[PDB]
């Protein structure tokens, strides 16, 4: 019977727990009592982008900090010029039930997918004037939850089967598959080094993967419920996660443990989406009550609110130059936010 | 004024895209979307197959059928290869016109169907969506209770006290034991529905068989009633 293997697993868990406990010499909260708080942060809606018919499910910024892609469950994929609000392209999808959206770092491609279990790559730059499907990647058994390009030829996906996969695009072949989660993998993000990525799943666990070795490096487990969103800290040494338990948490890859948690007694609804600012000092989180809260990432004080949306905040993202935040909602609008002097 | 020649041309392109979005907005609103749910034992496969015939990929995660009644277009969806856990993907459907819930009335498994319906009805995002409820395989239920070999009160002991409601319509000339059985099973779903509907959404029960052609008319009439209540709400008459 496996009870000996269970006992060995429990013994190993006890060993790991004690090792992590021994490292918890002092908390981040004690150390950051020195620094000045950020003070009140205020941001204004600088643009509203509108034209989607149904709820917006995802968005992603281009690396130029100016082009933006957005997906809605009416089956359009739209590319926006952020400065002018001009629509650059409108792409009709084969399936309405899109759930994820990505912009290639070169801007040559966008990727899309959802309940079809298929990830579709669209070529934006061709000798004809029209966008068309370059490749359809099929082999996941459940819905596509997230996808991110490593480059124009490699893309990483996660799905409702408890699995992530790395694909070639030239051949539609899974080059590697990552297995070990026991629930739906809900979100994914790449390290800046691109050699590593983290995934969060409906098992209240997060895992660190090596894209080259194809194996789980580490597992993090502080949350009490499904992890909906994950994001690397700009240094790449830490990441944040948001859950239906209404908390965010910050983990460091080398202390191997939770540094800090962001929560308040007035907040009792799930977190949909998370991002840092360019310095990492601000953590932005979107909520089912359709505000966004801005957190001092070092002190865990709440420091501001974005409060323009009429319905669930589904996605948000910060430009690579840090100049603006965009938020999308089931109200079917995107709003772009910036501070003021 | 201040725009360059190319900037004016880029704006003209953007306006033609909007002109296209405004066109297919009319197609999107003129079409009603339906989610079809039911366990493996339910006859839902026969419903879509029959309905696909009478009117109008190996890991496909979702399937669709199109049908039309009185020049009104319906798209009906049912999930394919998804896993058994559904608390996440079900949130996509928060904006369909109705959910069609199909039950095998002969597997008194019924408790499993009740717990499923209770979850759909109470969920934070699916509330405000009305449920059309097909109590299917009524022919098998009739034969099963007439054979007397297995007793509903082995599973629902309150059935010893239930008596046929005065609304009961035994129009087929059915045996009254069949009638009492049918309306008991129906009333167990209505017990759940009336406990929390708050007037925002309603359940529409129908007794059905796999061979029955009328199912397309049933869905049409219920969607008419659902949409009529929605208009009465937003015109502030309600």
């Amino acid at each position: 019977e496996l009870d000996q293997l269970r006992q060995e697993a429990e013994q190993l868990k006890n060993q790991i727990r004690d090792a992590r406990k021994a490292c918890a010499d002092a908390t981040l909260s004690q150390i950051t009592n020195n620094i000045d708080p950020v003070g009140r942060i205020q941001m204004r809606t600088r643009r509203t982008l509108r034209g989607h018919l149904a709820k917006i499910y995802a968005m992603h910024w281009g690396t130029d900090s100016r082009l933006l892609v957005s997906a809605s469950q009416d089956g359009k994929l739209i590319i926006w010029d952020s400065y002018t609000t001009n629509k650059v392209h409108a792409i009709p999808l084969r399936s309405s039930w899109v759930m994820t959206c990505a912009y290639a770092p070169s801007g040559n491609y966008v990727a899309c997918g959802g309940l079809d279990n298929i990830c579709s790559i669209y070529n934006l730059k061709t000798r004809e004037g029209n966008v068309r499907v370059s490749r359809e990647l099929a082999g996941h058994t459940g819905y596509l939850s997230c996808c991110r390009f490593l480059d124009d030829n490699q893309i990483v996906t996660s799905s409702g089967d408890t699995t992530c996969a790395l694909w070639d695009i030239e051949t539609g072949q899974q080059t590697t598959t990552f297995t070990g989660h026991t629930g739906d993998v809900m979100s994914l993000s790449l390290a800046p080094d691109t050699r590593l990525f983290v995934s969060g799943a409906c098992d209240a666990s997060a895992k660190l993967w090596d894209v080259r070795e194809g194996m789980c490096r580490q597992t993090f487990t502080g949350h009490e419920s499904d992890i909906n969103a994950i994001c690397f800290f700009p240094n790449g040494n830490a990441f944040a996660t948001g859950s239906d338990d209404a908390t965010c948490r910050l983990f460091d890859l080398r202390a191997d443990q939770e540094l800090m948690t962001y929560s308040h007694d007035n907040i009792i609804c799930g977190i949909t989406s998370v991002s840092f600012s360019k310095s990492g000092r601000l953590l932005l989180a979107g909520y089912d009550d359709f505000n966004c809260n801005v957190w001092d990432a070092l002190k865990a004080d709440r420091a501001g609110v974005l409060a323009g949306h009429d319905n669930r905040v589904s996605c948000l993202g910060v430009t690579d130059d840090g100049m603006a935040v965009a938020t999308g909602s089931w109200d079917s609008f995107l709003k772009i936010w910036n501070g003021s002097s | 004024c201040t725009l360059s020649a190319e900037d004016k041309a880029a704006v003209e392109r953007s306006k033609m895209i909007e002109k296209q979005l405004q066109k297919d907005k009319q197609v999107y609103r003129a079409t009603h979307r339906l989610l079809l749910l039911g366990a493996d034992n339910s006859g839902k496969s026969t419903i879509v197959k029959q309905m696909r015939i009478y009117h109008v990929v190996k890991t496909s995660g979702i399937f669709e059928t199109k049908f039309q009644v009185d020049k009104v277009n319906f798209h009906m969806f049912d999930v394919g290869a998804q896993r058994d856990e559904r608390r996440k993907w079900i949130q996509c459907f928060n904006d369909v016109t109705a959910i069609i819930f199909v039950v095998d009335s002969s597997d008194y498994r019924l408790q499993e169907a009740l717990n499923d319906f209770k979850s759909i009805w109470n969920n934070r995002w699916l509330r405000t969506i009305s449920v059309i409820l097909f109590l299917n395989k009524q022919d098998l239920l009739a034969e099963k209770v007439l054979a007397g070999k297995s007793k509903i009160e082995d599973y629902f002991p309150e059935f010893a006290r239930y008596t046929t409601p005065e609304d009961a319509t035994p129009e087929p000339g059915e045996d009254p034991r069949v009638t009492r059985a049918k309306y008991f099973i129906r009333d167990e779903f209505l017990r759940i529905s009336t406990a929390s509907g708050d007037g925002r959404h309603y359940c529409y029960p129908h007794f059905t068989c796999s061979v029955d052609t009328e199912n397309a008319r049933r869905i049409f009439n219920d969607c008419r009633d659902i949409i009529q209540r929605m208009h009465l709400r937003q015109y502030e008459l309600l």
Partner: single-chain antibody
Framework: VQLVESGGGLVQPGGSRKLSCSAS????????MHWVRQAPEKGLEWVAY????????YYADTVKGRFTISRDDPKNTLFLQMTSLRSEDTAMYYC??????????????WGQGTTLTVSASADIVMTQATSSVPVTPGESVSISCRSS???????????LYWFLQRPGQSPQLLIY???NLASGVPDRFSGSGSGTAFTLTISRLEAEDVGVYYC?????????FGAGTKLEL
């Protein structure tokens, strides 16, 4: 992708003629189209423009009362109707596509052109400093162009284009908005400028680089070309 113009031929003064350009292999309805003409030993001259969706039209003042431009997207075909023809109209006429959105490259493809023979102000002027330069293979060479007005718009783009015409071919786009290398061309070409003076440079000449180089401004209609600089090789 191809364009092929048809019509042309010999016409009496005061006569009328229709040119037609038929598109194939691309999403013709989504492109704006231009007509450009070249008198038999002269530089290029922009003639007319028809927008995508026909919502905008422009003409050169030399034709503004005389010619009309139209398109039929269902038949993927473009027409120029000419009337009151003059000896001045004797030229090769080229059909040229363009598409405008952030990051697009206008003027990227040119037809082969129809020859037409007729029996017998506030415009920005573009100056190219030499009509010809003698060059050798492996040499590095630079061509200069200059404008009567600053082409730097307040949005920060510099609306300068460079074209090469080889002696047997229609023009080819080399560079758009001063600095962006066209998709097909070798990375031997580079472009720079101040907003009023500009240079095209070739890092290493090869036998295919022989031809006439034309600069064009796209800040304002009418579009205007330089007189062109020959390379002799």
């Amino acid at each position: 992708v191809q364009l092929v113009e048809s019509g042309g031929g010999l016409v009496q003064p005061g006569g009328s003629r229709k040119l037609s350009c038929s598109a194939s292999g691309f999403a013709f309805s989504s492109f704006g189209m231009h007509w450009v003409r070249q008198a038999p030993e002269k530089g290029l001259e922009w003639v007319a423009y028809i927008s995508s969706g026909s919502g905008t039209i422009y003409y050169a003042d030399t034709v503004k009362g005389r010619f009309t431009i139209s398109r039929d997207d269902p038949k993927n075909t473009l027409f120029l109707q000419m009337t009151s023809l003059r000896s001045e109209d004797t030229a090769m006429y080229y059909c040229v596509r363009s598409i405008y959105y952030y990051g697009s490259s206008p003027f990227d493809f040119w037809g082969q052109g129809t020859t037409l023979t007729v029996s017998a102000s506030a415009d920005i002027v573009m100056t190219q400093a030499t009509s010809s330069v003698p060059v050798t293979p492996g040499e590095s060479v630079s061509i200069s162009c200059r404008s009567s007005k600053s082409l730097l718009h307040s949005n920060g783009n510099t609306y300068l284009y460079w074209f090469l015409q080889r002696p047997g071919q229609s023009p080819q786009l080399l560079i758009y908005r001063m600095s962006n290398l066209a998709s097909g061309v070798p990375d031997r070409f580079s472009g720079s400028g101040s907003g009023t003076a500009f240079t095209l440079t070739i890092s290493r000449l090869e036998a295919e680089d022989v031809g006439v180089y034309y600069c064009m401004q796209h800040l304002e209609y009418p579009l205007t070309f330089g007189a062109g600089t020959k390379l002799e090789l």
